[PDB]
TrEMBL record, chain A:
Organism taxonomic ancestry: Bacteria, Bacillati, Cyanobacteriota, Cyanophyceae, Nostocales
Protein name, per record: Uncharacterized protein
The organism's place on the tree of life at top rank: Bacteria
Portion of the parent chain present: 78 to 154 of 383
Organism: Nostoc sp. 'Peltigera membranacea cyanobiont' 210A
DNA sequence: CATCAGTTCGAGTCTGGTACTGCCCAGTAGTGATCTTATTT
DNA sequence: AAATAAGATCACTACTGGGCAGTACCAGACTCGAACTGATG
């Protein structure tokens, strides 16, 4: 995908995370969504997709920040 | 655990028995913070603060922290800074070593520029915010900015001298000498049995003039580089020279300030270098003794007093219109000055009273209009319908709002 | 005599001691909905 | 294991302290233009 990345921007070839064993009894889908969004959304800061959920935006250093106020369905969206 | 402004307003202001101290404890004592340079000074405010702090703390050595010992020997002209000066290296060293962080009195003298202990200059601006800070403020903290509340100490000073080997080294040596002399002066403030008087300066001048200029004030004045009229002002009248002039004289004589103040050690010495060194030839003089006629100023001020204008000007406006200085006018005519100042003050008081009674009237009218539509009248909702939604800080606008709500049942 | 040093008068400039104006924000205690965790049967 | 409690958190609302950038005044005081006047080589 290197020629495609050079020709077309805002497209990540492959994204991969590893599932987390939850601290609690049940699997944490909230943390899964947060970590997937963090890992996927690390291109150059030029690609500002301004997700339609408030509470997920860029910062001064270009990292992804998500506060605890964002609910799991909003993270999934 | 309280802010210094809160402590002064709620515990130090009531104890003092001055009108502006009791009246300023319910409004924000900005008078004592805009003029905090005189709290460490030789004046009456410093003495009163020392006495009230002594009463609050039951201490006996608080007068050493000020210059009240040097009241009759030192003048307040150019002696104290307007802004806080600190050595960041001093703060960092005191905090790292576990010692308490404190502000020394030596930093409060304008003549001092660099810290003798650390060989770096005193920084007078917060590194994080380029904002000036007074000596004492509402949110003052030892080592923290009184405007942003962040640490002011650093391992290395952020200000560095320019690259120059012509006069920078000489200026640095001069600054070190002044720092050492002023520090030793402060140290000797406690050792002396009694405060030296002004007549010590006269006796010292009588010795040095006879010893270097063979009883000639003009030659001495030319040597140091200050006008001979000021020498006459000093040596035969009760006028105390500024600390800068005394330090310059002592530097030219190689004899320290404390050794110059004593009239005994001056007798047994034979200065020779003072004649050798003289580097004061080009000094910029004052502008001019501008003309001042009693008849013209008196007629103009009588006309402005009789003439009714709106609103009645303050005296700075009158002086600026005349292109003069306030002190020059007030020296000859202090009575009509007070008359004009009064007229303006009563006009301002009447205007404030009428405007604020009106503001209460609109407050009542707005609460009427808001309760007419059924919406709950709160302070914020009423504030949203006012040109200046801050008038409730007055403690009768809020009273009128509360009375109007309680009459209506809230 | 004309040059220079000791003397007065008064304005430029500081500065403390005293007094007062004009305006909104913040900290806190409630309720209501909605998690997240914790006891019952 | 399902059902029932209960604390935590977010969000909004109403209430009540309460201070800072800024102006103003009043003589006391220092410093030195500008000049006045007397001794002197
Ligand atoms: Zn230091
Ligand atoms: Zn700061």
């Amino acid at each position: 995908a290197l020629p495609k990345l050079e020709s077309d921007r805002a497209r990540v070839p492959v994204v991969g995370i590893e599932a987390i064993a939850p601290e609690s009894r049940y699997f944490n889908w909230k943390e899964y969504y947060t970590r997937a969004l963090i890992t996927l959304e690390e291109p150059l800061i030029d690609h500002k997709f301004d997700y339609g959920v408030r509470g997920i935006s860029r910062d001064n250093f270009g990292k992804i920040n998500v506060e605890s106020k964002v609910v799991a369905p909003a993270l999934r969206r | 655990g309280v802010l210094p402004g809160v402590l002064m307003t709620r515990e130090i202001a009531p104890l003092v028995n001055k009108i502006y101290f009791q009246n300023g404890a319910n409004r924000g004592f900005r008078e004592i913070f805009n003029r905090s340079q005189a709290l460490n000074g030789m004046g009456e405010m410093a003495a009163d603060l020392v006495q009230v702090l002594q009463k609050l703390t039951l201490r006996d050595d608080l007068r050493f922290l000020t210059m009240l010992f040097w009241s009759n020997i030192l003048t307040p002209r150019n002696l104290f800074r307007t802004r806080k000066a600190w050595c960041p290296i001093c703060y960092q060293e005191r905090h790292q070593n576990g010692l308490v962080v404190y502000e020394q009195l030596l930093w409060t003298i304008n003549l001092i520029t660099i810290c003798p202990q650390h060989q770096k200059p005193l920084v007078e601006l917060c590194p994080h915010c380029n904002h000036e800070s007074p000596l004492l403020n509402w949110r003052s903290r030892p080592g923290y900015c009184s405007k942003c509340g962040e640490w002011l100490g650093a391992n290395q000073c952020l200000k560095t001298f320019t690259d120059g080997e012509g006069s920078i080294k000489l200026q640095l040596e001069w600054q070190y000498w002044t720092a050492n002399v002023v520090g030793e002066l402060i140290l000797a403030s406690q050792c002396f049995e009694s405060a030296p008087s002004k007549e010590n300066i006269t006796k010292s001048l009588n010795i040095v003039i006879d010893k270097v200029a063979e009883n000639n004030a003009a030659a001495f004045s030319r040597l140091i580089g200050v006008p001979k009229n000021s020498l006459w002002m000093w040596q035969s009248t009760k006028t105390l020279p500024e600390l800068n002039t005394l330090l310059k004289i002592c530097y030219e004589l190689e004899i320290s300030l404390v050794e110059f103040l004593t009239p005994k050690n001056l007798i047994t010495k034979s200065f020779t270098k003072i004649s050798q060194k003289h580097l004061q030839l080009s000094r910029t003089p004052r502008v001019s003794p501008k003309s001042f006629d009693q008849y013209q100023v008196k007629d103009a001020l009588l006309a402005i007093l009789a003439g009714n204008e709106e609103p009645p000007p303050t005296m700075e406006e009158v002086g600026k219109r005349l292109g003069h200085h306030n002190r020059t006018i007030s020296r000859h005519f202090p009575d009509l000055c007070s008359a004009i100042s009064a007229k303006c003050r009563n006009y301002n008081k009447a205007c404030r009273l009428k405007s604020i009674e009106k503001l209460c009237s609109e407050v009542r009218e707005i609460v009427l209009s808001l309760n007419a539509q059924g919406v709950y009248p709160t302070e914020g909702r009423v504030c949203e319908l006012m040109p200046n939604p801050g008038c409730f800080r007055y403690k009768q606008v809020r009273a009128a709002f509360n009375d109007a709500r309680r009459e209506f049942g809230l």
